[PDB]
């Protein structure tokens, strides 16, 4: 399912891009001949008038051949004879179509309802502080409500995450933090963690003390703790947060534990021995927290507006990532090669189809942004070539044209091999 899902994803993406190219071209009286999808020997081709469609064997890329692109043909249907601005529009049609596709699928997903954890929308209340972390070190007591950082005013945990990732990308270190408790806005000087590489603020949201799953073969499974049941107390200790149950289990360290479980309206004093698991010398109970999720369905117009906003935010984030990469801020190992695309597509497919759709939107946006950079033998380089010819009024020298095309082919090839070996390195771990 994974490999075929990756294949169909790459196929629909390249088809959308080349179809945008083709429709923009047909809206300007040109003749298209090759509609090659991918590379290698064409697996099968069907002819319909001038437009001969084919599909090839190796689906990595895809390119389209027109009539009179750069040849010295004076026929009106020749692409070379066309005005430079129309050629620029033809070049931009691809990424523009990709962006339109991403916005449309995002809006469709939003209208169909997205499933998100409920804590992602509730007000920012710190239900648990990680021990000896930045939040604890600065002095964030549990139950404190964060109202502002730097910037981006925060009201939802999603807003806090977005502000944190933006601050990490911006390379800010010391940040003013307006935190509220008992009507006191206590300004603090927080240290922004490099959330790009994993480290976080050590702030946890409120989580109800209820079990949603149990590992089969776990001692809790042998005791009889079925999933979907809430737990009242542990050894009589008043606990109102699942993280407090986690703390109690962590401090048990193998001691016999008497869990007062509220079994759907009745109290059971279950006895457990969560000893030090020989796998890591750690407490083992084989439990799963009960995750809570909500499905949202925005109004169609409001869904479209939200999709536009999200597309703008993701475009800004990708542009910032590109700028950081060109400045050395982010290492080259974070690039996503086609094999990484395959593995993440398989992960999305096994996750579901709506996650598959949103990941398709994100990767389509990534492809559209990538194909816009100024680079020979790319959907962005020809824009630069035609703009140069337009501003100077004459075509680029033919020898310079050959040099430009050759160096572009070389750099594309070498970067593809580099990202390929990066993919193999990722596969190794």
């Amino acid at each position: 399912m994974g490999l075929i899902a990756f294949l169909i994803l790459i196929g629909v993406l390249v088809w959308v891009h080349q179809f945008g190219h083709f429709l923009m071209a047909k809206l300007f009286r040109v003749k298209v001949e090759i509609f090659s999808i991918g590379f290698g020997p064409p697996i099968f081709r069907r002819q319909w008038g001038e437009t001969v469609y084919q599909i090839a064997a190796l689906p990595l890329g895809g390119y389209v051949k027109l009539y009179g692109e750069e040849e010295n043909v004076h026929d009106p249907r020749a692409f070379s004879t066309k005005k430079p601005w129309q050629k620029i529009l033809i070049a931009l049609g691809g990424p523009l179509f990709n962006f339109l596709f991403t916005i449309l699928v995002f809006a469709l997903v939003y209208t169909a309802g997205v499933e998100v954890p409920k804590y992602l929308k509730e007000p920012v209340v710190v239900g648990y502080v990680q021990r000896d972390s930045i939040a604890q070190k600065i002095g964030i007591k549990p139950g404190d409500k964060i109202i502002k950082i730097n910037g981006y005013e925060v009201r939802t945990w999603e807003d806090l995450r977005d502000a944190l990732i933006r601050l990490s990308l911006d390379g800010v270190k010391e940040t003013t933090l307006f935190l509220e408790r008992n009507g006191e806005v206590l300004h603090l000087t927080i240290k922004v963690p490099n959330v790009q590489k994993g480290e976080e603020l050590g702030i946890a949201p409120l989580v109800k003390p209820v079990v949603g799953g149990v590992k089969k073969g776990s001692p809790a499974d042998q005791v009889g703790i079925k999933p979907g049941d809430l737990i009242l107390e542990v050894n009589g200790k008043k606990i109102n947060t699942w993280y407090e149950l986690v703390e109690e289990v962590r401090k048990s360290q193998g001691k016999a534990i008497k869990l007062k479980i509220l079994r759907n309206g009745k109290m059971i004093e279950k006895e457990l021995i969560p000893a030090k698991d020989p796998k890591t010398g750690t407490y083992f109970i084989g439990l799963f927290p009960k995750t809570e999720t909500v499905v949202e369905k925005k109004p169609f117009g409001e869904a479209l507006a939200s999709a536009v906003n999200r597309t703008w935010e993701l475009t800004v984030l990708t542009l910032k990532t590109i700028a950081g990469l060109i400045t050395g801020k982010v290492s080259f190992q974070t690039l996503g090669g086609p094999i990484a695309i395959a593995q993440i597509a398989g992960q999305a497919a096994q996750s579901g189809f709506i996650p598959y759709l949103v990941m398709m939107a994100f990767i389509s946006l990534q492809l559209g942004i990538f194909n816009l950079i100024p680079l020979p033998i790319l959907d962005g380089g020809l824009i630069l070539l035609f703009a140069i010819e337009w501003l100077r009024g004459r075509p680029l020298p033919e020898k310079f044209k050959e040099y430009w095309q050759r160096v572009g082919l070389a750099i594309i090839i070498t970067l593809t091999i580099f990202v390929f070996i990066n993919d193999i390195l990722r596969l190794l771990r």
Partner: antibody
Amino acid sequence: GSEVKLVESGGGLVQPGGSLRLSCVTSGFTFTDYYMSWVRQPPGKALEWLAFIRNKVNGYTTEYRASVKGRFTISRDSSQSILYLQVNTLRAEDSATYYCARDRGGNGVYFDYWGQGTTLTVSS
Amino acid sequence: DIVMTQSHKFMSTSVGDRVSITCKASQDVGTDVAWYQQKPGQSPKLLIYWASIRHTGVPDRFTGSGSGTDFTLTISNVQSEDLADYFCQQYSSYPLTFGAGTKLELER
């Protein structure tokens, strides 16, 4: 302002069974905002963490290595940026270089700035 | 408690080469690991924390990697000012523990 600076004092030769207090004078940073520790470095042996003390907002609580609890005491001065470490019942195994250190604010205590260290020799 | 085991007490290298210093934890510590450098007669100096985050002011030659139990400090393009002792440290659980250290020896 001045850069981070830590200077230890109180080392020297001390007979077994005695007591003394080591000092660490700090400068260049707000003293009450950072964890302080007394990790030790014996000659040609690995580092041994001894204790650390939390900030003002955390009640100045202390954490100790189990082997030295009840023997070693870490503390801060009331009105000066000076850290102290009282040590009693000294034995020959305590002879080492004692380092005072300022920790970063990241996740979990690590030591971002170290003092020069002071050498203690315990023998009769 | 948690024991940080550096299998090599000495490691040979030349100026301009790459060195990989290994460190093995007694149990899973995730990524709560820091690395330090100590030159003769000087205090230790933190280079990397969280397995892969370079400290401010540390040159790009020092890189850390690894997760779980087999963390590694790689020094690309060894310069002459790197002849020193390098050791790891974990802060996943108390008490905090250090490695025994690794001394850089020059080849000839």
